[PDB]
Amino acid sequence: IANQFNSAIGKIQDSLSSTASALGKLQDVVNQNAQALNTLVKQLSSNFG
């Protein structure tokens, strides 16, 4: 049971070292807030007539 836990934690390190998209839920929050601040800046370019 100890060797299985130690081996299963080894796969957490290997996974987080290997695959880029693991934290997709958190990066998508940072992306949404940054996209909103960038859209709000670009809207200063609008003439509105």
Partner: protein, 49 residues
């Protein structure tokens, strides 16, 4: 330069601090614009810098 002023370059009035830029304007350009569609660099009309 390096002080806050009410500038006016060729009718481009604004409030800002002027600074010596490394932005390489090609000969035909006089104003450079930011993502917000506002001027963030200008060629001085007496000293061509």
């Amino acid at each position: 330069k390096n002080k806050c002023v009410n500038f006016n370059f060729n009718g481009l009035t604004g409030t800002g601090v002027l600074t010596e830029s490394n932005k390489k304007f090609l000969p035909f350009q006089q104003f450079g614009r930011d993502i917000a569609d506002t001027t963030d660099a200008v060629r001085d009309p007496q000293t061509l810098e």
